[PDB]
């Protein structure tokens, strides 16, 4: 469906990369990869409904979906959490001190995987 499948494939790969990052102990990177899984999955859902979407805000990605797509409120809350992982997980100036990587923990990254999985599952069922 005009590459929608390719983006879903990328989203699943990104989520596997976040799972493996968890195993490497690279929590901030796992969080970034989870936001990337969510982003790619939603861009794929947009493509399947004939739209091209942009950016890194999964909040906008969810808000711009066709009217016939019902978005549960829990996905909006997941979006707000994941949205803080696109830039702060990699750039030191997003935090008061130290490198970006040290501000992220395992529990945060597992929660990030959980939230991204909810997004992926919603997309897989709406495709």
């Amino acid at each position: 469906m005009n590459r929608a499948r390719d983006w879903l494939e990328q989203a699943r790969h990104n989520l596997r990369h976040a799972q493996g990052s968890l195993g490497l102990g690279d929590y901030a990177w796992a969080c970034f990869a989870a936001q990337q899984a969510a982003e790619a999955a939603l861009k794929g859902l947009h493509l399947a409904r004939g739209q091209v979407a942009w950016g890194h805000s999964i909040l906008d990605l969810l808000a711009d979906l066709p009217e016939d797509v019902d978005v549960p409120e829990d996905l909006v809350e997941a979006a707000k959490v994941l949205d803080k992982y696109y830039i702060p997980t990699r750039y030191p100036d997003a935090h008061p001190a130290g490198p970006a990587a040290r501000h992220y923990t395992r529990l945060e990254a597992e929660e990030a995987l959980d939230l991204a999985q909810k997004i992926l599952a919603f997309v897989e069922e709406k495709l």
Copy 2:
């Protein structure tokens, strides 16, 4: 000073995530993290010199350094290669078909690690 060191430590962490990614078999993510190690290292060098720099172009980051910093042609060549891993390693629309991930090889990832190490060593040297 000016957090140059926080950025260098982020660079090193990025390079370590690149090495783990190679271990996971996630070659496209290893290439992306290598570009991120180089980008963070050079941003750190600009901070050390009291300049702030922006973007994801290692080529522009090298070209914008102060006249007195000697940049071997080697690094410019390396920048050109790394610059192609910021977006294509994660986004399917940067390729003709399939997800982005399948278009990157183990050798590509091995070399990206080497090129980012070259860039990091240069920055540590001029720091």
